[PDB]
RNA sequence: AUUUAGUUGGGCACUCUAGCGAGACUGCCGGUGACAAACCGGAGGAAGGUGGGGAUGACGUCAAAUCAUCAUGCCCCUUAUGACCUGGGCUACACACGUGCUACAAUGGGAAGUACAACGAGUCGCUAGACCGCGAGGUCAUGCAAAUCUCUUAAAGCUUCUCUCAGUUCGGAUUGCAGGCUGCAACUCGCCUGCAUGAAGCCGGAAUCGCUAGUAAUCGCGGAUCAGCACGCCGCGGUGAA
């Protein structure tokens, strides 16, 4: 915080596919100390995904991910005390963080009255580069290098 | 909420039955804040105390349900 | 057998030494004594706002505890019975002879 | 006025729903521990003086 | 028009739709249907012409009408025209217990 | 006869594990392990001791339990297993420690404090 | 071994209860360091580097607060500003603000089955059990001044079915009627139940608050004052993130 960086609390793998990413995604759906429900919508969404175009709940998942995880980011810094936003070389981990964040959040507004159809359709559309999360990453990369001229030698 | 019968204080009953023979005297001063209304009261004229002044009010028929305190309001707003 | 004694005080030293005394008065004459059985030690709680007019932030909470013991005996001879009847000390902890 | 009031309670009340609690040495009307019959502050202080058997400070 | 006084919807579930009519809550519908011996049927109601008459008969044994309001109206009328503090504050809306009104208008008038 | 024991504690819950040679099984309070447990597939959690020693069968488990929630005591059986396997061979404890799962998690609910709505929550507070 | 059961035999092994002890001290390893203090990593160990938490508040600042807990100089009332009783206030409502609770639903609404804590209260009080009324409850009776008996099988949880995106079966403010409890007495001015009616309200600007872990978020339990009345306050525990 002020002294120095701090530890990071790694998670356990999943009890079905044994994936650190799967657990790290189940956690980012839970709301208010209620977990089992999140696991249930995860598994049901996974089965729905594998149903139409059965390849894997994991492989198409990573496809959608690499479609999303960005490579730059505007980092507002007042080196000149002004509204300088300098493109930053985003770290490895925060990339996955933002992947999951955009996925879940922006999928929450997809709008299937059904419980988990929202997620499944979202990642299936992302793996094929259709959907605003893909547009979100491309917008981040289009605002980065939109001003890399005066914000790079820093 | 008193299903073991209603209630009116005795220093009003004896003072309201005492007219059942003849005509009624226009005045029955009281405290007038703990008594519901019984059928034996119709046609009287009871003044009602509001902590400040007694309020003279007659007795009609349908005005028989509630307690005595719902006619001299102690608020006086306006 | 047909006799036992409860203890309820605050400082454990007095309770424990009363325990030792009664065990002497029991296993002296006869035998078949039971040890100083511990017990759950009920506890209380209060909360006093540590001010006098305002500032309901500053709380000051107090407490109370009641250690307990328990001892039964078997085959009480007339000797130790009357020794119990005569033993009264200490006088900081309340005991009660009970069947 | 505390003297007329204190004298009030020592009598048997006019009706049963009238016998409330009030400290003995002091005379606070509110918040008297009806296990001790002390007010809030008087018990607070007297605890310091080592004159209530039992009560101490509670750290845990 | 439609089936009981007025106000019955189409393409719904039965027991829910029977609550719609003014004066029928939820217990009323279940007990009424009990006295016929029916069920949901189903989510688009497909009643038979005989069941309709059965319910039209069992309903006409209830004070609930498109007229329940007249009784309530006359009751608050008897109220407001004798004393009446309850009736007086019923010219301005206060209950059987009062609630120390310095917010209790946000449900009656939109005071702000 | 031969019987093996070991205890476990988590979040103020405690389970009294009992081990014996079998096929790989556990009867929680005379019930199948999938009864006491809800839906919970935190069963890899429970067999996780086995996934490192005596991999991954096969003994049986008698188990009593009381206290805490389900997740608490569920995690609290995990440690009777560790202690039992420890009873068998004191040649295993190194590979247990390196993989951990041997020391008692002392995290527990916090002693609250007067003046704060929760263990640390501070009430919203008007500035001016 | 046997019974409905740890009950009853049998036992004190375990669990737990609670006294006395034991244990964490940079104690040993490597390194950095002027060889010092200290610092980075290691073994062992349940915990490693003030292990986690609390109680504990220096000189003084602010003529901060308090003669209404109590005390007290001075000034004052004294057939009245002292005192007794009934009735009403402190609960008043065009309005402005601070703190909280319930919500705007599909991780949801309803219906049916299914398990798991912890802290404490109890003699004029906790009610067992059974009977009655759909309910708040009533009737007769049962133990308990206590690890025995009761409050009290905790609720979210887990398993099925129905409801389909609507001011909706969401929301239940408000109001009519009939009841229950304590109470000498519930209009002013109690808590709760049943029926009936069914408001605003579909995530909230400028602005602004809390929070670094068993925390935040969320769900229940208890008790202080107390015939009676808690969304407040004081404690406990369950689930469990970034
Ligand atoms: Zn006092």
CSV table of N, CA and C (backbone and C1' of nucleotides) in Angstrom, one decimal, chain G residues 111-168:
chain,number,residue,atom,x,y,z
G,111,A,P,-45.9,-20.6,0.6
G,111,A,O5',-46.0,-22.1,0.0
G,111,A,C5',-47.2,-22.6,-0.5
G,111,A,C4',-47.0,-24.0,-1.0
G,111,A,C3',-46.3,-25.0,-0.2
G,111,A,O3',-47.1,-25.6,0.8
G,111,A,C1',-45.5,-25.2,-2.4
G,112,A,P,-46.4,-26.1,2.2
G,112,A,O5',-45.6,-27.4,1.7
G,112,A,C5',-46.3,-28.6,1.5
G,112,A,C4',-45.4,-29.7,0.9
G,112,A,C3',-44.2,-30.1,1.7
G,112,A,O3',-44.6,-31.0,2.7
G,112,A,C1',-43.5,-29.7,-0.5
G,113,G,P,-43.9,-31.0,4.1
G,113,G,O5',-42.4,-31.6,3.8
G,113,G,C5',-42.1,-32.9,4.3
G,113,G,C4',-41.0,-33.5,3.5
G,113,G,C3',-39.6,-33.5,4.1
G,113,G,O3',-39.4,-34.6,5.0
G,113,G,C1',-39.5,-32.7,1.9
G,114,U,P,-38.8,-34.3,6.5
G,114,U,O5',-37.2,-34.0,6.2
G,114,U,C5',-36.4,-35.1,5.7
G,114,U,C4',-35.1,-34.5,5.2
G,114,U,C3',-34.3,-33.7,6.1
G,114,U,O3',-33.4,-34.6,7.0
G,114,U,C1',-34.5,-32.6,4.1
G,115,A,P,-33.7,-34.6,8.5
G,115,A,O5',-32.2,-34.7,9.1
G,115,A,C5',-31.7,-33.6,10.0
G,115,A,C4',-30.4,-33.1,9.5
G,115,A,C3',-29.7,-32.2,10.4
G,115,A,O3',-28.9,-32.9,11.4
G,115,A,C1',-29.6,-31.3,8.2
G,116,C,P,-28.8,-32.3,12.9
G,116,C,O5',-27.6,-31.2,12.8
G,116,C,C5',-26.4,-31.6,12.2
G,116,C,C4',-25.5,-30.4,12.0
G,116,C,C3',-25.5,-29.3,13.1
G,116,C,O3',-24.6,-29.7,14.1
G,116,C,C1',-25.7,-28.3,11.0
G,117,A,P,-24.9,-29.3,15.6
G,117,A,O5',-24.9,-27.7,15.6
G,117,A,C5',-24.6,-26.9,16.7
G,117,A,C4',-23.6,-25.8,16.4
G,117,A,C3',-23.2,-24.9,17.6
G,117,A,O3',-22.1,-25.5,18.2
G,117,A,C1',-24.0,-23.6,15.8
G,118,A,P,-22.0,-25.4,19.8
G,118,A,O5',-21.8,-23.8,20.1
G,118,A,C5',-20.7,-23.1,19.7
G,118,A,C4',-20.9,-21.6,19.9
G,118,A,C3',-21.4,-21.3,21.3
G,118,A,O3',-20.4,-21.2,22.3
G,118,A,C1',-22.7,-20.2,19.6
G,119,C,P,-20.8,-21.2,23.8
G,119,C,O5',-21.3,-19.8,24.2
G,119,C,C5',-20.6,-18.6,23.9
G,119,C,C4',-21.3,-17.4,24.2
G,119,C,C3',-22.1,-17.4,25.5
G,119,C,O3',-21.2,-17.0,26.6
G,119,C,C1',-23.5,-16.7,23.8
G,120,G,P,-21.7,-17.3,28.1
G,120,G,O5',-22.6,-16.1,28.5
G,120,G,C5',-23.6,-16.2,29.5
G,120,G,C4',-24.9,-15.7,29.1
G,120,G,C3',-26.1,-16.1,30.0
G,120,G,O3',-26.2,-15.1,31.1
G,120,G,C1',-26.7,-16.5,27.8
G,121,A,P,-27.0,-15.5,32.4
G,121,A,O5',-28.5,-15.5,32.0
G,121,A,C5',-29.3,-14.3,31.9
G,121,A,C4',-30.8,-14.6,31.9
G,121,A,C3',-31.2,-15.5,33.1
G,121,A,O3',-31.5,-14.8,34.3
G,121,A,C1',-32.1,-16.3,31.0
G,122,G,P,-31.3,-15.5,35.7
G,122,G,O5',-32.6,-16.5,35.7
G,122,G,C5',-33.9,-15.9,35.8
G,122,G,C4',-35.0,-17.0,35.6
G,122,G,C3',-35.0,-18.1,36.7
G,122,G,O3',-35.7,-17.6,37.8
G,122,G,C1',-35.1,-19.1,34.6
G,123,U,P,-35.3,-18.1,39.3
G,123,U,O5',-36.7,-18.0,40.1
G,123,U,C5',-37.6,-16.9,39.9
G,123,U,C4',-39.0,-17.2,40.4
G,123,U,C3',-39.1,-17.2,42.0
G,123,U,O3',-40.4,-16.8,42.4
G,123,U,C1',-39.6,-19.4,41.1
G,124,C,P,-40.6,-15.3,42.8
G,124,C,O5',-40.6,-14.5,41.4
G,124,C,C5',-41.8,-14.0,40.8
G,124,C,C4',-42.5,-15.1,40.1
G,124,C,C3',-43.8,-14.7,39.5
G,124,C,O3',-44.1,-15.4,38.3
G,124,C,C1',-44.2,-16.4,41.0
G,125,G,P,-44.9,-14.8,37.1
G,125,G,O5',-43.9,-15.0,35.8
G,125,G,C5',-42.7,-14.3,35.8
G,125,G,C4',-41.6,-15.3,35.5
G,125,G,C3',-41.9,-16.4,34.4
G,125,G,O3',-41.8,-15.9,33.1
G,125,G,C1',-40.7,-17.3,36.3
G,126,C,P,-41.9,-16.9,31.9
G,126,C,O5',-40.5,-17.5,31.7
G,126,C,C5',-39.9,-17.5,30.4
G,126,C,C4',-39.4,-18.9,30.1
G,126,C,C3',-40.4,-19.9,29.6
G,126,C,O3',-40.6,-19.8,28.2
G,126,C,C1',-39.1,-20.9,31.3
G,127,U,P,-42.0,-19.1,27.7
G,127,U,O5',-42.9,-20.4,27.2
G,127,U,C5',-43.5,-21.2,28.1
G,127,U,C4',-43.0,-22.6,28.0
G,127,U,C3',-44.1,-23.7,27.7
G,127,U,O3',-43.5,-24.7,26.9
G,127,U,C1',-43.1,-24.2,29.8
G,128,A,P,-44.4,-25.8,26.1
G,128,A,O5',-43.9,-27.2,26.8
G,128,A,C5',-42.5,-27.5,26.9
G,128,A,C4',-42.3,-28.9,27.2
G,128,A,C3',-43.1,-29.9,26.5
G,128,A,O3',-42.7,-30.2,25.2
G,128,A,C1',-43.0,-30.5,28.8
G,129,G,P,-43.8,-30.3,24.0
G,129,G,O5',-44.8,-31.4,24.5
G,129,G,C5',-44.3,-32.8,24.6
G,129,G,C4',-45.3,-33.6,25.4
G,129,G,C3',-46.8,-33.5,24.8
G,129,G,O3',-47.0,-34.4,23.7
G,129,G,C1',-46.8,-33.2,27.1
G,130,A,P,-47.6,-33.8,22.4
G,130,A,O5',-49.2,-34.0,22.6
G,130,A,C5',-49.7,-35.3,23.1
G,130,A,C4',-50.9,-35.1,23.9
G,130,A,C3',-52.1,-34.3,23.3
G,130,A,O3',-52.9,-35.1,22.4
G,130,A,C1',-51.7,-33.6,25.5
G,131,C,P,-53.6,-34.4,21.2
G,131,C,O5',-54.8,-33.5,21.9
G,131,C,C5',-55.9,-34.2,22.4
G,131,C,C4',-56.9,-33.1,22.9
G,131,C,C3',-57.3,-32.1,21.8
G,131,C,O3',-58.2,-32.5,20.9
G,131,C,C1',-56.8,-31.1,23.9
G,132,C,P,-58.1,-31.9,19.4
G,132,C,O5',-58.9,-30.5,19.5
G,132,C,C5',-60.2,-30.3,20.1
G,132,C,C4',-60.5,-28.9,20.5
G,132,C,C3',-60.3,-27.9,19.4
G,132,C,O3',-61.4,-27.8,18.5
G,132,C,C1',-59.2,-27.1,21.3
G,133,G,P,-61.2,-27.8,17.0
G,133,G,O5',-60.9,-26.3,16.6
G,133,G,C5',-61.9,-25.3,16.5
G,133,G,C4',-61.3,-23.9,16.4
G,133,G,C3',-60.3,-23.7,15.3
G,133,G,O3',-60.8,-23.5,14.0
G,133,G,C1',-59.5,-22.7,17.3
G,134,C,P,-60.0,-24.2,12.8
G,134,C,O5',-58.5,-23.9,13.0
G,134,C,C5',-57.4,-24.7,12.5
G,134,C,C4',-56.5,-23.8,11.7
G,134,C,C3',-55.8,-22.7,12.5
G,134,C,O3',-54.6,-23.2,13.0
G,134,C,C1',-56.6,-21.8,10.4
G,135,G,P,-53.9,-22.5,14.3
G,135,G,O5',-53.8,-21.0,13.9
G,135,G,C5',-52.7,-20.5,13.1
G,135,G,C4',-52.5,-19.0,13.4
G,135,G,C3',-52.2,-18.6,14.8
G,135,G,O3',-50.9,-18.6,15.1
G,135,G,C1',-54.1,-17.4,14.0
G,136,A,P,-50.4,-18.9,16.6
G,136,A,O5',-50.5,-17.5,17.3
G,136,A,C5',-49.8,-16.4,16.8
G,136,A,C4',-50.4,-15.1,17.3
G,136,A,C3',-50.7,-15.1,18.8
G,136,A,O3',-49.5,-14.8,19.6
G,136,A,C1',-52.6,-14.3,17.7
G,137,G,P,-49.2,-15.6,20.9
G,137,G,O5',-50.5,-15.4,21.9
G,137,G,C5',-50.9,-16.4,22.7
G,137,G,C4',-52.4,-16.5,22.7
G,137,G,C3',-53.0,-17.4,23.8
G,137,G,O3',-53.1,-16.8,25.0
G,137,G,C1',-53.9,-18.0,21.7
G,138,G,P,-52.8,-17.7,26.4
G,138,G,O5',-54.1,-18.5,26.7
G,138,G,C5',-55.4,-17.8,26.9
G,138,G,C4',-56.5,-18.8,26.8
G,138,G,C3',-56.5,-19.9,27.8
G,138,G,O3',-57.0,-19.6,29.0
G,138,G,C1',-56.9,-20.7,25.6
G,139,U,P,-56.6,-20.5,30.3
G,139,U,O5',-57.1,-22.0,30.0
G,139,U,C5',-58.4,-22.3,30.1
G,139,U,C4',-58.6,-23.8,30.1
G,139,U,C3',-57.7,-24.5,31.1
G,139,U,O3',-58.4,-24.6,32.4
G,139,U,C1',-57.5,-25.6,29.0
G,140,C,P,-57.5,-24.6,33.7
G,140,C,O5',-57.0,-26.1,33.8
G,140,C,C5',-57.9,-27.2,33.9
G,140,C,C4',-57.2,-28.5,33.7
G,140,C,C3',-55.9,-28.8,34.5
G,140,C,O3',-56.3,-29.2,35.8
G,140,C,C1',-55.6,-29.4,32.2
G,141,A,P,-55.1,-29.5,36.9
G,141,A,O5',-54.4,-30.8,36.4
G,141,A,C5',-53.1,-31.1,36.8
G,141,A,C4',-52.2,-31.7,35.7
G,141,A,C3',-50.8,-31.5,35.8
G,141,A,O3',-50.1,-32.4,36.6
G,141,A,C1',-51.5,-30.9,33.6
G,142,U,P,-48.9,-32.0,37.6
G,142,U,O5',-47.6,-32.2,36.8
G,142,U,C5',-47.3,-33.5,36.2
G,142,U,C4',-46.2,-33.5,35.3
G,142,U,C3',-44.9,-32.7,35.8
G,142,U,O3',-44.1,-33.6,36.6
G,142,U,C1',-45.5,-32.0,33.7
G,143,G,P,-43.7,-33.0,38.1
G,143,G,O5',-42.3,-32.3,37.8
G,143,G,C5',-41.1,-33.1,37.7
G,143,G,C4',-40.1,-32.5,36.8
G,143,G,C3',-39.1,-31.5,37.5
G,143,G,O3',-38.1,-32.2,38.1
G,143,G,C1',-40.0,-30.5,35.5
G,144,C,P,-37.4,-31.5,39.4
G,144,C,O5',-36.8,-30.1,38.8
G,144,C,C5',-35.7,-30.1,37.9
G,144,C,C4',-35.5,-28.7,37.3
G,144,C,C3',-35.3,-27.6,38.3
G,144,C,O3',-34.0,-27.6,38.8
G,144,C,C1',-36.9,-26.9,36.7
G,145,A,P,-33.7,-28.1,40.3
G,145,A,O5',-33.1,-26.8,41.1
G,145,A,C5',-33.8,-25.6,41.0
G,145,A,C4',-32.9,-24.4,40.8
G,145,A,C3',-31.9,-24.2,42.0
G,145,A,O3',-30.7,-23.5,41.6
G,145,A,C1',-33.4,-22.4,41.9
G,146,A,P,-29.3,-24.1,41.9
G,146,A,O5',-29.0,-25.1,40.7
G,146,A,C5',-29.2,-26.5,40.8
G,146,A,C4',-29.0,-27.2,39.4
G,146,A,C3',-27.8,-26.7,38.7
G,146,A,O3',-27.3,-27.8,38.0
G,146,A,C1',-29.8,-26.3,37.4
G,147,A,P,-25.7,-27.8,37.5
G,147,A,O5',-25.8,-27.6,35.9
G,147,A,C5',-24.7,-27.4,35.1
G,147,A,C4',-25.0,-27.7,33.7
G,147,A,C3',-25.9,-28.9,33.4
G,147,A,O3',-26.6,-28.7,32.3
G,147,A,C1',-23.8,-29.3,32.4
G,148,U,P,-28.2,-28.5,32.4
G,148,U,O5',-28.8,-29.9,32.8
G,148,U,C5',-28.4,-31.0,32.0
G,148,U,C4',-29.2,-32.3,32.3
G,148,U,C3',-30.7,-32.0,32.3
G,148,U,O3',-31.4,-33.2,31.8
G,148,U,C1',-30.1,-32.9,34.4
G,149,C,P,-32.4,-33.1,30.6
G,149,C,O5',-33.5,-32.1,31.2
G,149,C,C5',-34.7,-32.6,31.7
G,149,C,C4',-35.8,-31.5,31.9
G,149,C,C3',-35.9,-30.5,30.9
G,149,C,O3',-36.7,-30.8,29.8
G,149,C,C1',-35.7,-29.5,33.0
G,150,U,P,-36.3,-30.3,28.3
G,150,U,O5',-36.8,-28.8,28.3
G,150,U,C5',-38.2,-28.5,28.4
G,150,U,C4',-38.4,-27.0,28.6
G,150,U,C3',-37.9,-26.1,27.5
G,150,U,O3',-38.8,-26.0,26.4
G,150,U,C1',-37.3,-25.3,29.6
G,151,C,P,-38.3,-25.6,25.0
G,151,C,O5',-38.0,-24.1,25.1
G,151,C,C5',-39.1,-23.1,25.3
G,151,C,C4',-38.5,-21.7,25.5
G,151,C,C3',-37.8,-21.1,24.3
G,151,C,O3',-38.7,-20.5,23.4
G,151,C,C1',-36.5,-20.8,26.3
G,152,U,P,-38.6,-20.8,21.8
G,152,U,O5',-37.8,-22.1,21.7
G,152,U,C5',-37.8,-22.8,20.4
G,152,U,C4',-36.6,-23.8,20.2
G,152,U,C3',-36.6,-25.0,21.1
G,152,U,O3',-36.0,-26.1,20.4
G,152,U,C1',-34.7,-23.8,21.5
G,153,U,P,-36.2,-27.6,20.9
G,153,U,O5',-35.5,-28.4,19.8
G,153,U,C5',-34.5,-27.9,19.0
G,153,U,C4',-34.3,-28.7,17.7
G,153,U,C3',-33.7,-27.9,16.5
G,153,U,O3',-32.3,-27.8,16.6
G,153,U,C1',-35.6,-29.2,15.8
G,154,A,P,-31.5,-26.9,15.5
G,154,A,O5',-32.3,-25.5,15.7
G,154,A,C5',-33.1,-25.0,14.6
G,154,A,C4',-33.2,-23.5,14.6
G,154,A,C3',-33.2,-22.9,13.2
G,154,A,O3',-34.5,-22.8,12.7
G,154,A,C1',-31.6,-21.8,14.5
G,155,A,P,-34.9,-23.2,11.3
G,155,A,O5',-34.6,-22.0,10.3
G,155,A,C5',-35.3,-20.8,10.4
G,155,A,C4',-34.6,-19.7,9.6
G,155,A,C3',-34.1,-20.1,8.2
G,155,A,O3',-35.2,-19.9,7.3
G,155,A,C1',-32.3,-19.1,9.4
G,156,A,P,-35.0,-20.4,5.8
G,156,A,O5',-34.0,-19.4,5.1
G,156,A,C5',-33.2,-19.8,4.0
G,156,A,C4',-32.0,-18.8,3.8
G,156,A,C3',-31.0,-19.4,2.9
G,156,A,O3',-31.2,-19.2,1.5
G,156,A,C1',-30.0,-18.6,4.9
G,157,G,P,-31.7,-20.5,0.7
G,157,G,O5',-30.6,-21.6,1.0
G,157,G,C5',-29.2,-21.4,0.7
G,157,G,C4',-28.3,-22.3,1.5
G,157,G,C3',-28.2,-23.7,1.0
G,157,G,O3',-27.3,-23.8,-0.2
G,157,G,C1',-28.5,-23.9,3.3
G,158,C,P,-27.8,-24.2,-1.6
G,158,C,O5',-28.3,-25.8,-1.4
G,158,C,C5',-27.3,-26.8,-1.2
G,158,C,C4',-27.9,-28.1,-1.0
G,158,C,C3',-29.0,-28.6,-1.9
G,158,C,O3',-28.4,-29.1,-3.1
G,158,C,C1',-29.7,-29.0,0.3
G,159,U,P,-29.3,-29.2,-4.5
G,159,U,O5',-30.6,-30.1,-4.1
G,159,U,C5',-30.4,-31.5,-4.0
G,159,U,C4',-31.8,-32.2,-4.1
G,159,U,C3',-32.6,-31.7,-5.3
G,159,U,O3',-32.3,-32.2,-6.5
G,159,U,C1',-33.9,-31.9,-3.3
G,160,U,P,-33.0,-31.6,-7.8
G,160,U,O5',-34.4,-32.4,-7.9
G,160,U,C5',-35.4,-31.9,-8.7
G,160,U,C4',-36.8,-32.4,-8.2
G,160,U,C3',-38.0,-31.6,-8.7
G,160,U,O3',-38.4,-32.0,-10.0
G,160,U,C1',-38.1,-31.7,-6.4
G,161,C,P,-38.5,-30.9,-11.2
G,161,C,O5',-40.0,-30.4,-11.0
G,161,C,C5',-41.1,-31.3,-10.9
G,161,C,C4',-42.3,-30.6,-10.4
G,161,C,C3',-42.7,-29.3,-11.0
G,161,C,O3',-43.4,-29.5,-12.2
G,161,C,C1',-42.8,-29.1,-8.7
G,162,U,P,-43.3,-28.3,-13.4
G,162,U,O5',-44.1,-27.1,-12.8
G,162,U,C5',-45.5,-27.2,-12.6
G,162,U,C4',-46.1,-26.0,-12.0
G,162,U,C3',-45.8,-24.7,-12.7
G,162,U,O3',-46.6,-24.4,-13.7
G,162,U,C1',-45.3,-24.5,-10.4
G,163,C,P,-46.1,-23.6,-15.0
G,163,C,O5',-46.0,-22.1,-14.5
G,163,C,C5',-47.2,-21.4,-14.0
G,163,C,C4',-46.8,-20.2,-13.2
G,163,C,C3',-46.1,-19.1,-13.9
G,163,C,O3',-46.9,-18.2,-14.6
G,163,C,C1',-45.0,-19.6,-11.8
G,164,U,P,-47.0,-18.2,-16.2
G,164,U,O5',-46.3,-16.8,-16.5
G,164,U,C5',-45.9,-16.5,-17.9
G,164,U,C4',-44.7,-15.6,-17.8
G,164,U,C3',-43.9,-15.5,-19.1
G,164,U,O3',-43.3,-14.3,-19.3
G,164,U,C1',-42.5,-16.5,-17.4
G,165,C,P,-43.9,-13.2,-20.4
G,165,C,O5',-43.1,-11.8,-20.0
G,165,C,C5',-43.5,-11.0,-18.9
G,165,C,C4',-42.5,-10.1,-18.5
G,165,C,C3',-41.4,-9.8,-19.5
G,165,C,O3',-40.9,-8.5,-19.4
G,165,C,C1',-40.4,-10.7,-17.6
G,166,A,P,-41.5,-7.4,-20.3
G,166,A,O5',-43.0,-7.3,-19.9
G,166,A,C5',-43.4,-6.5,-18.8
G,166,A,C4',-44.8,-6.8,-18.4
G,166,A,C3',-45.4,-5.9,-17.3
G,166,A,O3',-46.8,-5.7,-17.5
G,166,A,C1',-45.4,-8.2,-16.6
G,167,G,P,-47.5,-4.4,-16.9
G,167,G,O5',-46.9,-4.2,-15.5
G,167,G,C5',-47.6,-3.5,-14.5
G,167,G,C4',-47.2,-3.9,-13.1
G,167,G,C3',-48.1,-3.4,-12.0
G,167,G,O3',-48.2,-4.4,-10.9
G,167,G,C1',-45.9,-2.7,-11.6
G,168,U,P,-49.6,-5.3,-10.8
G,168,U,O5',-49.2,-6.7,-11.4
G,168,U,C5',-49.1,-6.9,-12.8
G,168,U,C4',-48.5,-8.3,-13.1
G,168,U,C3',-48.7,-9.3,-12.0
G,168,U,O3',-48.9,-10.6,-12.6
G,168,U,C1',-46.4,-9.0,-12.6
